[PDB]
Ligand binder design. Structure first.
Ligand SMILES: [K+]
Ligand SMILES: [K+]
Lengths: 370, 78, 370, 87
């Protein structure tokens, strides 16, 4: 019942989401063509993940929560929860049940397809209506990382089931990192040379410390890797073109792929003139990037999703290095999932607080003599 | 006296492992504090205090594996 | 008082420290050496800084506080505070009390000379007795960054007064500090230690990119010993890593330095091909608890960078090597003291408790998906 | 009878501070305040220090507004009452 929604939220938000490893995905999708086991996992797990995050959507500032776009998103989540909860009483041993469940997941995925730009629209509707509030901004920042990571994880779950039951799903067991780098480059180059009429070359190098001569492969979701690389390539290309005057001497974008025992690291280096350090932190800020640009903070979420990271280090006047850190081993590649609990609830009860450190005066005392 | 039972922390959870008690006998418990870490087959969940009081006894000690639902873990008095 | 010490601490701790810029240090010694205003500034400011940090000292775990080494350090701070308070009602314009004040500063600097290793032995005495609990460790980390930065700031003030009132430097500040010369010095000293502790050492490569003026060597207003400290520590690590990860004395990769100057930032990147370290271990390198066997060079070098609004960042690529970047403010007006204040906000940081965690943790025995 | 009120006075935030400047108020009129809340930014020649609430209650009126410089020590900046309806 639509009326009972707030109690279904209470029931399922009380549970903790179940983070899966890429090993588990791989062991399941290659051994278990078992639709029943996936159905019975997902008919519980998807409501758990939905209810956990919806519990946090409802902890948003009233001014954000009440925007048309955030209300539209919330209604999507309500309906998707209701769609899946219809399968709770259903017999896993009936194939009509299973075929209808896959159809319901396709519908949910189509419905939620524009969640990212719609949520960003809502934040923009808040920005261009309710001036500036720091505490609200920090709660929004806190929420958005979790919401978007939750969303990445739900889509992953839906993608695994649908690709397997109507690559191991979206997972490539033998993903050629260099090939994904080239694909991302080729696409960004295309957009660059058709929006500037000039583009930098690519230089790739590999250092495989585990096996000196072997091309670097990993178990990964290629589209996630591509997403990250594509966003970073575009930035490096834009920066390179905008900071240079000649068509003929554009510095190349340099890629280093390194594989160690624990990490697979991909560094992208540009000579695009760099950016001041004080500005690096706002590049992952959702509030700063909403004009009057969610590529970077979301790319970092893709890296964090399986316990990796994405870090930037520029040198103002020279250029910037961007590093994607990934886990080399599939047992280490575990889902990074937000969980609603009292600990999460406290993060929304943040107050306006005095500084931890001294703030210098805007007009410091003149110390020169007479 | 209040008795704290092991809940379902996952929809299909039958049992959990009491990985570590994060509170001591005599310690005050506020509503929302970390009482213990319960490890399941699916996750390790931080089990939070839901009723305020004082921890008097631990019935199911640290490291105890495969404890079913509704099992009295500790007794708390207000 | 000696008896009234906690009243004096309460009085002076209620005041904010006064963060000074590199420009203000420079303008003070731009012409006349005025001992009077410095005396009257420092006889108040040093008690303020001492008292602020001493409130935080007696807020740490009692198991750390009762430790002999922390007891000794705290006794130095009580004495130093008392020594200065004796000048509180003394008259400037009287040249004897100025001369006595300088004597009192050198005495304070001499007894505080070993504050860093002593505080570290205190953490060590705590380690080999109580082990570790998440909450106490969290407070020790938070405290030590503040304690050591307070220390750097107090030593800076004392150094400024004693060097001026007891070379082209304005105290410890070089108005025209050649970044590359400091890089060369730090390297030469580290090379020397390396070539004697391994009998092999990497070469140095330096490049400069001055974006503000393409053909001018990069200079800045800075305290050269501060810059030397950071670079010396980084050079040693990069040399150790390079030597220990290589088999040949004839073919070992040079350490590469890039100095960049832009409108806002002065950046120094040190790159080694020392084999790198996993990302998991990077965050551990700036923790004080982990870096005490069973090595405070890194977190302390970072504090030196942070002290004038800079930073020190590491990014490694496991299997390849590590980049270390020092960020400095390019402008003396932006190079301002980073000082901890004791307030209710600082107090709250010592009132933390064990909490659930707002992100899902996987099982150590994850479900076999077959 | 007069509602039991507590008054916030501008103190010395530096040992050699006599005058004060209210940079920006962080609590609007009508807001509750806990012992530890940021009340306002009081700027001087030496530092911008975040002034903290030391007495719980509610903000009733701002006596000394924003931007106003040279505010003496002990000068009442705002009025705080024990209860909510007392505003
Ligand atoms: K939950
Ligand atoms: K203070």
């Amino acid at each position: 019942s639509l009326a009972g929604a707030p109690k279904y939220i209470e029931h399922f938000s009380k549970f903790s989401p179940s983070p899966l490893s890429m090993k588990q995905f791989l062991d399941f999708g290659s051994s278990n063509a078992c639709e029943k086991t996936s159905f019975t996992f997902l008919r519980q797990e998807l409501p758990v993940r939905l209810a956990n995050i919806m519990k946090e959507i409802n902890l948003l500032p009233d001014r954000v929560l009440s925007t048309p776009s955030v209300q539209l998103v919330q209604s999507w989540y309500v309906q998707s929860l209701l769609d899946i909860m219809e399968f709770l009483d259903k017999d896993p041993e009936d194939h009509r049940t299973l075929s209808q469940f896959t159809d319901a997941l396709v519908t949910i995925r189509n419905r939620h397809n524009d969640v990212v730009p719609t949520m960003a629209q809502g934040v923009l509707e808040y920005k261009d209506t309710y001036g500036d509030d720091p505490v609200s901004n920090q709660n929004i920042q806190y929420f958005l990382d979790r919401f978007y990571l939750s969303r990445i994880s739900i889509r992953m779950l839906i993608n695994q089931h649908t690709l397997i039951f109507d690559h191991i799903g979206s997972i490539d067991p033998n993903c050629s990192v260099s090939d994904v780098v080239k694909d991302a480059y080729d696409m960004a180059k295309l957009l660059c040379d058709k929006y500037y009429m000039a583009s930098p070359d690519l230089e790739i190098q590999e250092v495989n410390a585990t096996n000196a001569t072997q091309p670097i492969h990993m178990v990964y979701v290629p589209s996630h890797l591509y997403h990250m690389l594509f966003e970073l390539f575009k930035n490096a290309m834009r920066a390179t073109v905008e900071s240079h005057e000649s068509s003929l001497t554009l510095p190349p974008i340099k890629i280093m792929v390194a594989l160690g025992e624990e990490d697979l690291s991909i560094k992208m280096s540009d000579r695009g003139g760099g950016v001041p350090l004080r500005k690096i932190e706002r590049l992952f800020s959702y509030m700063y990037s909403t004009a009057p640009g969610y590529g970077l903070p979301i790319s970092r979420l893709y890296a964090k999703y399986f316990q990796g990271d994405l870090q930037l280090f520029s040198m103002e006047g020279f250029g910037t290095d961007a590093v994607i850190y990934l886990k080399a081993l599939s047992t280490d590649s575990v889902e990074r999932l937000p969980v609603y609990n009292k600990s999460a609830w406290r993060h929304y009860q943040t107050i306006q607080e005095a500084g931890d450190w001294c703030v210098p005066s805007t007009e410091p005392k003149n110390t020169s003599t007479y | 006296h209040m008795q704290v039972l092991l809940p379902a922390l996952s929809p299909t959870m039958t049992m959990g492992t009491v990985q570590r008690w994060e509170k001591k006998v005599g310690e005050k418990l506020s509503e929302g504090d970390l009482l213990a870490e319960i490890e399941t087959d699916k996750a390790t969940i931080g089990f939070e205090v839901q009723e305020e009081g004082y921890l008097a006894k631990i019935l199911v000690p640290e490291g105890t594996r495969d404890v079913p639902l509704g099992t009295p873990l500790c007794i708390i008095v207000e």
